[PDB]
C-alpha cells in the first residue's frame, strides 16, 4: 500500500499545484498512467496558499529526470537526479533532503512507516544541475524492500516525490569490464577475455560489438554472450574488429553497465596460428595460414609454403583442412643456428609467384645436457656439474637443477615423478657449474634432471638415476713400500688398502727404472685378500719406481689417483757368480830361485758383482797343501813371491754377503815352464783401428785348454795389455787405438792344466 | 627388483655404517629396536651422529624390503661416547644374527 | 687521376662489396628476383639504364641500410657512400652535372613495416642490392647515358 | 629652475642660521658665487626661534666634505659626506637621510618633484666621520637627471641641503687596468698590452707612469696615451720598469683610478727580443741583443756573442739594426743536445771578456716521425703506428695524432689542411704508439700526422697521404698442396687465391727438401688467371716442402705471409729404366745335365728402380721358349734346376707401376765352355784395400762384350762377391778388404754372346 513499483526504471517527474513553507506535490507523467501519492515526510503541511502565488508557478517549471540503481560494489545506491528546465539565465541554489528506508522482514502486517524511520542524507548537485547522491545499504538488506522519498528545496519552494519502493539488486548496472586483449591463439580463434567484475553477485549477459570492417567489404555483427570472456570463431585476415563490451543482468531486467571506449584490433593480410613455436631436437610441429588476396581469399589448392626463404618445401607434407586453411607438418626437425642477432627460423606461406612478408617463428633448443658425478672417499660430499658452453641455442635463459630420491635406488621407470625440489648451483671458471650435496644417503637413488625456461615456455631434459655408493672414487693407498728381495732376485711390493670403501677391490701396479721418463710397465691383482706381490725384473739392483691405484672389482665405481710413488734403495744381494780373471807378471831376476810375481786384475763389473763386492782376497795352495787368505782392499793389484816348485793360486771377491763359488785358477811350476808348443806367431795392422794374430803350433802331451797374448808399446813404456783367447780359434782380431809408426811386441803364451810353459815372443808386426 | 643382491648390500652397507661410527632374531623386534635407537639418536645434532642417523634408516628401509621379501606384511614400530659404543655393540649383533638369516 | 683509373677502380669496389654481400649468412641462397607483396619500395627487379636513376637506387639503398645495427651493414653503407661520390666524378667527365639526390619521401611505410616484420626486411634488401649491383657492372661496359 | 650642477664634483657645505624641529638651511662657500635654494622637503617648518640658542651655533661648525660619484660597476651611486670638525672629545650620533628621484624624460613642463617622490635610502656612517649612502642607479637612467637632497640630524638639529642636479653616466671613476703582461715585440719594441677593464663601456685615458728603476739612469715619464697595446721603442739593459698606469675615463670628466700594486719587472742587464721561440730541423732564425756594461749601453758593433760561453759566432752572420741592436741569424741549426740540466743553448751576449751569466733559450725539434699504416686482409680496420725513440732533444712534450679525410683520392698539392680531427693512439710494449681506425673508407684519402705539445707552443710534421687501399696485406693462400706428376717427372704445386683483394694477383713459390735445416729455390708466377704449376727436379723420391705467397701486381701493396707448407708422400712413378745384375754360382756337378743352378743378385738400390721395389720376376728362356718366371719376392737368392741344353737367363723387376722393359741378358753354352782366349793374369797386392789385376788376352774368334771376375777365400770360405767391367780396359783395380795370410781364389771370366769359355781360375797372388 501506498507504493508505486519502478517499472520500468525510467520515470519522468513533473510537480503541480495541490512561501517559507510552501511545499508542492510531484507526481510521475506516464503514457497511460498518473499516480500521486502523498509521502510520509509532511502531514501537518495543511495550509492555505494564495492564488496570487500560483503565477510564480507559471515561471518555474519543476519538471526533473530523477533515476538510479545500485552499483556493481553493493555498496552504494548512488541516484541521479537532472534539471529538464536548463535555463543558463537563472541559475537555483535547490538543497535535496533524502529520506531513505530499508525495513527488515516482518511478518506481522504491512505497517506503513512512521516519522524518523528514515534516513537523511544531504544530495550533492553538481554546478550544472546534475545531482548524484551516495546512498550506503547494509548488504544483508540487498533482496529486501527500499524505500524513497525526496524533498527539493528551491528559492524556498519545497517539491515533493511520492514513495518509490523497488529492489537494489534486480537492475544493478554493472562496471565497465576490463583486463581485455587481443591476440590470436593456437587454434585461429580471438579471444574477448575480459576481467569481469568479481563485486557482482549474480550471472551477467553482456552485449558485445563488433563486425568484419575492411576497405571494401564492410559488414556489422553485433552480439549478445553469457560469459565472462568469449571466444570469436573463425577469424579472417583483413577484417578490423571494433569489439566493445557492457555487462547487465542475466536474469529477470537490469541496467546495461558503462559503455567503454571501443577497442580497435586489425589483422593482416596474412594470419598465422600458432604464430611462435618452441620444440626440441627430435620433434613434430605444425602451423596454419589463412590468404587474402586483393580482397579475395585464396583457395587452399594453390598454396605453397617456404623455409627462411631459401628452400622452397616438398609438396609430400602439405595437408589439406577446409577451403581457405592448410597444414604443414615438419618431420624430425634439426637444431637452428643463429644466423646474426636472429635465433630463430622463419616459416612463410603463400601461393603462385607472390609471398607476404609476414611470417611465423619457430624456434629450436637442444636438451641433451649431461650430468654425472662423484662420491668423494669418505662418503660425504657428492659433487656435479653439468657444461653449457658447447651448446648455443641459449644465452637466452635461466636454468635450474631438481631432485627426486625417496626409498632405495632409481632408474625403474617413467614419470620423472613431477614432483621435485629445487637446489641452486653456482659457476666456476673452467666453464662448467658444480654443486655440493651434503650429507647424503649413501644408497638412495637420485633421479636429476635440468630445467630451461624460456621467454615462450618451459622444457625439461632427459633425468639421469645416479646411486651414490656405486659411484665412490676411493683414495690412494698408503705406505706403499717396494724392496728386492733377499737372495732370490725379486721385486715385492707391499701396501694396506684404504679404509673406504667397505667393498672389495682390485690394485693395478704401475712400475719400472727410475728416471726422468720411463716406459712403466703394467700387472693387475685380481684379489681382495692379496696383498704383497713377487715380480721379476731384469736386473738387479738399478733403482726402480712404483705407484698403485685401486678400484672396485664388480666394474663398478671409479679408479683411484695413483699414489706417492715410492723408490727402492740399492743394496747388495747375494754372492757374485765369476771371479776375476786374474794374471801374472814378473818383474825379477831369471837367475833367483825366488820370483816376485805380481797379479794384476781388472775391477769387476756390476752385474758380476751383482751391485758392489768391496773387497778381494787371494788363496794360495803349495804341493804340501800350503793355504791362506789375505786382504788386498779396493786395490786391484797385488804380489807376493814364490820358491816352491809347484804352487796355485786363486783370487776370491767378498762383499756383503759371501765369498765367491765359481773363480779361476792358475799354478806357477818351472819343472813345466819348459814346453813350448807354439812355432810361429804372425802380427799385421789392417788400419788404424784392426790388427790381425794367425799362429802355427806343434801338438803336444798335456791338455791345453787357453792361451793368452801380451802386448805393449816399445817407443814408449805403455801398460801391459791382454785378453783371453781359447785354444780352439788359430786367428783373432785386435781393435783399438794404433798408429803403425811406432813399435809394439807380442807374447803368446800357451797354458795347461798346471801352468805355463815356454812362451813365444815377437818384437815386430810380420 | 631380484632378491638375490640385498644380503650383499645389507652386509656391506652395515660394514660401512660400523666402520664410520668407529671412527668418531624376529623382524618386529628388529624394527623396533632400530626405531628406537633412531629416537635415541636425533637427540645430538653433531656432525657425525647426524650422518650416521642419516644412515640409519637407510638400513631400516632396507630391513622393511627384506622383510616384505618373504611376504611379511611387518607393522611400523658422558652419554654420548656410551651412546656410540651400544649403537657399535647392537650393530655387530644385527651382523651375527642376520649371517644366519632368521624368519620373520 | 686518369680516367681510365676510376673505370677500373668502380669495378675493383662493386666486386668487394658482392663479396662482402656473400659473406652474410642470412643472404646465402634467395635470388633476387623474388616477389615480395609488401615490400615494393625495395629498389631492384625492372632494369636501370640511365646515371640519375642508378645515383637514386643507392641513395635508396644507403637511406634503407641506415636502419640496421649491424657492423658488416655499416662497412657496406660507408662503401656505398665513397661509390656515390665516384660516380658523380664519371657524370662529371662528359658535362652531365648531377643533383645530390635524397632519401625519397616514398620511404612512409619503412617504419612500420619493420616493426612487423623485420627479419624478412633485412634480407629482401641485402639481396637485391647485391642483384642490382650486378647488374650496375654489367652496364658500365657499355657506358649508359648522362 | 631650483637646481645647481655640481661643477666641480668636490664641494664644501656650510650651514647657517636664518629644538625638537628646528631646521637650518646650509649653503655651499664656492670662490665667486653663494648659491642658496630651500629644498622641498620640508615646507611647514617655518617655526619661530629663540635668540639665546645661537650661542650652540657658537660650539657646531657644520662644515661638510660630501663627495657624489658612481661607481665602475654602474650598480650604486656612492656618495661620500665627511665631518670637517675632527673633534675627539664629543662623537655625535647624526643620522644622515638622502632623498633622491631620478624623473622619467617628461616633455610636458619641467615640473617640480612633490613630496613622497623622493626616495629615501639610509647611509652607513662610520665611527671615523664617514657616511656612506649607496643609492641603487638603474643603468636605463644613468644618462637621465638625477636630483639629491641631505638631511641630517645631529643633537636634535636639522640641516637640509639644496636641491642640486646631476647626470650620473658623466662622473664615472674608472677601475686600474689589469693583465699587465710585459711582453716584448718581435721586433724589439716592448709590447705593454694591458687588458681594458670590462666593466668600462667606454675608452680611458691611461696615465702610464713607467718608470725605469735602472742602476743610474731614472725616468718618471707619465704618458697620458689611451691605447692599451703600449709600445715602448728602445728598451735599455738593466732597465727594471715598475709601470704605474691608472687610467681615467677618455670620454667625458672622470677621476684617476685607485693605486693598484706595482709592476715591478726587472730586466737583468741583458734584454732580448723574445728569445721563446721553436725552431725545427733545418729552420732559419735571427736574434739581437743589447748589453749593459756599466751606463754606456753596448754598441751593436762590439757584440761578443756567444753560445756554451763559448764558440763567438762569426762576424759573417753579423747585420746591424740600430746603434745597440745586431743581428745574430741562425741558419739550420742541428738538434740540441742535452747536458747537464739544459735543454737549449744558452745565448750569450757580452762585450770583450767581462761576460755575465744570464742566457736565452734555443729550442730545436726533430719532428721528423714517420708514421706507416696497414690494413686487414678482411679489409675491415687499419691499423697506424709511430715511433718516438728519437725525440730525445726536447722530451715531456706531449704527442698528439690528427686525422682529416678527404672523399675521394688525395691531391697532389702539399698543404696541411686547416682542419682536423684529433685521435687518441694507446702505446705498445715495443716503444711504439699504435691505433685503428675502424670502420674504414676504402678510397678516401687520408692525410695524418703528429702535433706536438711543448711549454714554449706547438709544432707540426709534414703530413703524409695514405690511402687504406694501396696498403693491403693479403691473405696467405688456402689449400696449398704439392704433388709429383706420373710418367712426367714434374712437380706440379695447386693453389686458391685468397677472397680479398679483388685486383689481380703474383705469386711467389717455393720449395725445397724436408728436414731441420731446409734448402730453398723460388720461382714467380706473373698471369692472374693460372692456378697450378710444373717445375722439374732432380730428386725423384724426396720429401718436398713448398709455400706460396701473394702481392697485388700493380705494385701497390705488401706481401703475405707464408701459408703452411705442404708436404709431399713418395710412390712410384715410373717402371724401373734399369734392370739388376745377376751372377752364375752354379754348383752342380759335370756329368749331370740337371745341375744345381744358383744364381746371385744384389738387392737394387733406391735411385734407379724409382725407390721402391716389392716384387721381383726371374723371367726364364729354353731353346723352346719356356717362360716360366715365377715371383721371387724379397728373396735375393735363387736356384734352377738346368732342364734343358741351351738356356737363357734374365733378371726383371716389378713395381707397382708395371714391369721392368730394359734389361740384362745372359746366354749359356757346353760346347765352348772349353775354349781359352785368356793366358795369363797377375794379381799383386799392393795393399790390403786394393789389389792390382792384369790378364792377357788371344786372337778370339767371336765377340767379346766384357768379363766377370770372382773372389773368394778357400781357407774359411769366404762371401763371394764380384764385379763386371768391360772389355775396354786391360789393368783393372779391385777395392776390397784383402789378407796376405790366408789364400784366395781368384775367378776371371772373359764373356761371349753364347756363355764363357774356361774359368781362368787362380790360387795364389801374383
Ligand atoms: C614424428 O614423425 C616421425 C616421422 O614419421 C612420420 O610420421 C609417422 C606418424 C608416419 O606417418 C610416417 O610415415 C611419417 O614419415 C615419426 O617416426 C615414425 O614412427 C613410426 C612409429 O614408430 C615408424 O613406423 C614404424 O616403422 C618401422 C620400420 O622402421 C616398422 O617396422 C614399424 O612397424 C612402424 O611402422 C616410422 O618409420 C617413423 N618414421 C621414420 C621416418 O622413421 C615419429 O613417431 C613422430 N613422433 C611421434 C611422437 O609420433
Ligand atoms: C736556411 O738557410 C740555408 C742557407 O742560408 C741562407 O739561406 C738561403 C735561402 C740563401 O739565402 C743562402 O744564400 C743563405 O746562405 C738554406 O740552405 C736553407 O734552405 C734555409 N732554410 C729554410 C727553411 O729556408
Ligand atoms: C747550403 C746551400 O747551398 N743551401 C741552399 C740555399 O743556399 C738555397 O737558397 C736553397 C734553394 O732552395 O737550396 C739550399
Ligand atoms: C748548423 C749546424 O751546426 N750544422 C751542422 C754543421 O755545423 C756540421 O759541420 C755538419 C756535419 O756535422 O752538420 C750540420
Ligand atoms: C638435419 O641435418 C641433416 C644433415 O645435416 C639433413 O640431412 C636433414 O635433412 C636435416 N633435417 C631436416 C628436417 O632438414
Ligand atoms: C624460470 O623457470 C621457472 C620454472 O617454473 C619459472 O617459474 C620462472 O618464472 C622462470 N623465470 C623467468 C621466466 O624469468
Ligand atoms: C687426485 O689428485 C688431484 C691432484 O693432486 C686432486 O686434485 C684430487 O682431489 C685427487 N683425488 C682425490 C679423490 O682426492
Ligand atoms: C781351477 O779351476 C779350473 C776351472 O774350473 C779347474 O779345472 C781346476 O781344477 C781348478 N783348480 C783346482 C786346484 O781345483
Ligand atoms: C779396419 O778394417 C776392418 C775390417 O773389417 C774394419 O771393420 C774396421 O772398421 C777398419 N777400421 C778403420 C778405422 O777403418
Ligand atoms: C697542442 O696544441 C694545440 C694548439 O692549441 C691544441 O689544439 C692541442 O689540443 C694540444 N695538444 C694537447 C693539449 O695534447
Ligand atoms: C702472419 O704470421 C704472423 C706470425 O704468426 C702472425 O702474427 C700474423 O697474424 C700473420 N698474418 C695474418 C694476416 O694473419
Ligand atoms: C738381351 O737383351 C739385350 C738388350 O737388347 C739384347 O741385345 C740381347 O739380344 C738379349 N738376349 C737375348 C738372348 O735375347
Ligand atoms: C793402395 O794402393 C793404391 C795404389 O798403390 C793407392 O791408390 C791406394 O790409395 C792405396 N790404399 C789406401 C787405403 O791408401
Known amino acids: 500500500n501506498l507504493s508505486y513499483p519502478i517499472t520500468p526504471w525510467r520515470f519522468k517527474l513533473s510537480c503541480m499545484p495541490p512561501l517559507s513553507k510552501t511545499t508542492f506535490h510531484c507526481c510521475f507523467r506516464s503514457e497511460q498512467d498518473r499516480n500521486c501519492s502523498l509521502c510520509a515526510d509532511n502531514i501537518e503541511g495543511k495550509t492555505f496558499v494564495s492564488t496570487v502565488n500560483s503565477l510564480v508557478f507559471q515561471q518555474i517549471d519543476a519538471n526533473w529526470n530523477i533515476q538510479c540503481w545500485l552499483k556493481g560494489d553493493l555498496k552504494l545506491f548512488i541516484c541521479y537526479v537532472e534539471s529538464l528546465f536548463k535555463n543558463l539565465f537563472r541559475n537555483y541554489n535547490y538543497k535535496v533532503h533524502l529520506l531513505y528506508v530499508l525495513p527488515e522482514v516482518l511478518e506481522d502486517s504491512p505497517l506503513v512507516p512512521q516519522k524518523g524511520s528514515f534516513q537523511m542524507v544531504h544530495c550533492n548537485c553538481s554546478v550544472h544541475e546534475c545531482c548524484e547522491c551516495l546512498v550506503p545499504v547494509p548488504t544483508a538488506k540487498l533482496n529486501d524492500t527500499l524505500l524513497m522519498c525526496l524533498k527539493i528545496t528551491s528559492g524556498g519552494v519545497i517539491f515533493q516525490s511520492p514513495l518509490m519502493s523497488v529492489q537494489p539488486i534486480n537492475m544493478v548496472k554493472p562496471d565497465p569490464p576490463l583486463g581485455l586483449h587481443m591476440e590470436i591463439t593456437d587454434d585461429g580463434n580471438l579471444k574477448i577475455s ?471 785358477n792358475l799354478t806357477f811350476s818351472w819343472p813345466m815352464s819348459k814346453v813350448n808348443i807354439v812355432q810361429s806367431l804372425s802380427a799385421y795392422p789392417l788400419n788404424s783401428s784392426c790388427v790381425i794374430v794367425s799362429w802355427i803350433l806343434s801338438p803336444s802331451d798335456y791338455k791345453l785348454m787357453y792361451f793368452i797374448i801380451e802386448w805393449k808399446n816399445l817407443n814408449e813404456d805403455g801398460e801391459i795389455k791382454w785378453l783371453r783367447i781359447s785354444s780352439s780359434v788359430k786367428k783373432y782380431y785386435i781393435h783399438d787405438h794404433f798408429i803403425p809408426i811406432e813399435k809394439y811386441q807380442f807374447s803368446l803364451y800357451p797354458i795347461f792344466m798346471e801352468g805355463v810353459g815356454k812362451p813365444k815372443i815377437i818384437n815386430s808386426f810380420t | 627388483v631380484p632378491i638375490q643382491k640385498v644380503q650383499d648390500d645389507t652386509k656391506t652397507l652395515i660394514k660401512t655404517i660400523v666402520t664410520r661410527i668407529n671412527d668418531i632374531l624376529t623382524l618386529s623386534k628388529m624394527d623396533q629396536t632400530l626405531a628406537v635407537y633412531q629416537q635415541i639418536l636425533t637427540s645430538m645434532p653433531s656432525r657425525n651422529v647426524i650422518q650416521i642417523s642419516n644412515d640409519l634408516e637407510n638400513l631400516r628401509d632396507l630391513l622393511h624390503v627384506l622383510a616384505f621379501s618373504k611376504s611379511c606384511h611387518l607393522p611400523w614400530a658422558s652419554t654420548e661416547v656410551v651412546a656410540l659404543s651400544r649403537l657399535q655393540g647392537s650393530l655387530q649383533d644385527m651382523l651375527w644374527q642376520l649371517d644366519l638369516s632368521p624368519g620373520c
Chains 1, 4 share one sequence.
Open chain 1, 194 to 664: 575480459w576481467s569481469s567484475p568479481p563485486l557482482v553477485p549474480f550471472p551477467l549477459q553482456y552485449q558485445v560489438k563488433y563486425s568484419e570492417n575492411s576497405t571494401t567489404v564492410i559488414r556489422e555483427a553485433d552480439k549478445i554472450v553469457s560469459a565472462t570472456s568469449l571466444l570469436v570463431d573463425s577469424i579472417l585476415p583483413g577484417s578490423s574488429y571494433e569489439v566493445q563490451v557492457r555487462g547487465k543482468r542475466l536474469d529477470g531486467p537490469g541496467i546495461w553497465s558503462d559503455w567503454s571506449t571501443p577497442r580497435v584490433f586489425t589483422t593482416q593480410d596474412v594470419i598465422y596460428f600458432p604464430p611462435k613455436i618452441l620444440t626440441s631436437v627430435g620433434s613434430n610441429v605444425s602451423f596454419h595460414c589463412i590468404y587474402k588476396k586483393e580482397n579475395k581469399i585464396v583457395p587452399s589448392k594453390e598454396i605453397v609454403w617456404w623455409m627462411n626463404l631459401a628452400e622452397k618445401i616438398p609438396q609430400s607434407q602439405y595437408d589439406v583442412v577446409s577451403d581457405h586453411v592448410s597444414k604443414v607438418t615438419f618431420f624430425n626437425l634439426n637444431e637452428t643456428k643463429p644466423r646474426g642477432k636472429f635465433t630463430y627460423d622463419a616459416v612463410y606461406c603463400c601461393n603462385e609467384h607472390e609471398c607476404h612478408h609476414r611470417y611465423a617463428e619457430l624456434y629450436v633448443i637442444d636438451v641433451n645436457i649431461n650430468i654425472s658425478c662423484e662420491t668423494d672417499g669418505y662418503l660425504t660430499k657428492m659433487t656435479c656439474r653439468w657444461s653449457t658452453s658447447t651448446i648455443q641455442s641459449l644465452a637466452e635463459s635461466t636454468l635450474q637443477l631438481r631432485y627426486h630420491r625417496s626409498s632405495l635406488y632409481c632408474s625403474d621407470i617413467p614419470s620423472i615423478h613431477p614432483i621435485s625440489e629445487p637446489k641452486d648451483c653456482y659457476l666456476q671458471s673452467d666453464g662448467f657449474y658444480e654443486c655440493i650435496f651434503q650429507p647424503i644417503f649413501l644408497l638412495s637413488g637420485y633421479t636429476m634432471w635440468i630445467r630451461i625456461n624460456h621467454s615462450l615456455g618451459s622444457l625439461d631434459s632427459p633425468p639421469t638415476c645416479v646411486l651414490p655408493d656405486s659411484v665412490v672414487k676411493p683414495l690412494p693407498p698408503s705406505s706403499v713400500k717396494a724392496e728386492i728381495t733377499i737372495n732370490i732376485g725379486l721385486l715385492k711390493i707391499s701396501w694396506e688398502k684404504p679404509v673406504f670403501p667397505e667393498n672389495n677391490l682390485q690394485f693395478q701396479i704401475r712400475y719400472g727404472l727410475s728416471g726422468k721418463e720411463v716406459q712403466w710397465k703394467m700387472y693387475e691383482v685380481y684379489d681382495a685378500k692379496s696383498k704383497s706381490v713377487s715380480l721379476p725384473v731384469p736386473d738387479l739392483c738399478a733403482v726402480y719406481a712404483v705407484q698403485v691405484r685401486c678400484k672396485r672389482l664388480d666394474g663398478l665405481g671409479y679408479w683411484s689417483n695413483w699414489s706417492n710413488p715410492a723408490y727402492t734403495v740399492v743394496m747388495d744381494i747375494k754372492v757374485p757368480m765369476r771371479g776375476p780373471e786374474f794374471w801374472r807378471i814378473i818383474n825379477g831376476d831369471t837367475m833367483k830361485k825366488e820370483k816376485n810375481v805380481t797379479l794384476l786384475w781388472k775391477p769387476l763389473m756390476k752385474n758380476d758383482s751383482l751391485c758392489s763386492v768391496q773387497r778381494y782376497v787371494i788363496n794360495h795352495h803349495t804341493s804340501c797343501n800350503g793355504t791362506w787368505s789375505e786382504d788386498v782392499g779396493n786395490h786391484t793389484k797385488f804380489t807376493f813371491l814364490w820358491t816352491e816348485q809347484a804352487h796355485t793360486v786363486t783370487v776370491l771377491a767378498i762383499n756383503s754377503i759371501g765369498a765367491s763359488v765359481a773363480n779361476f
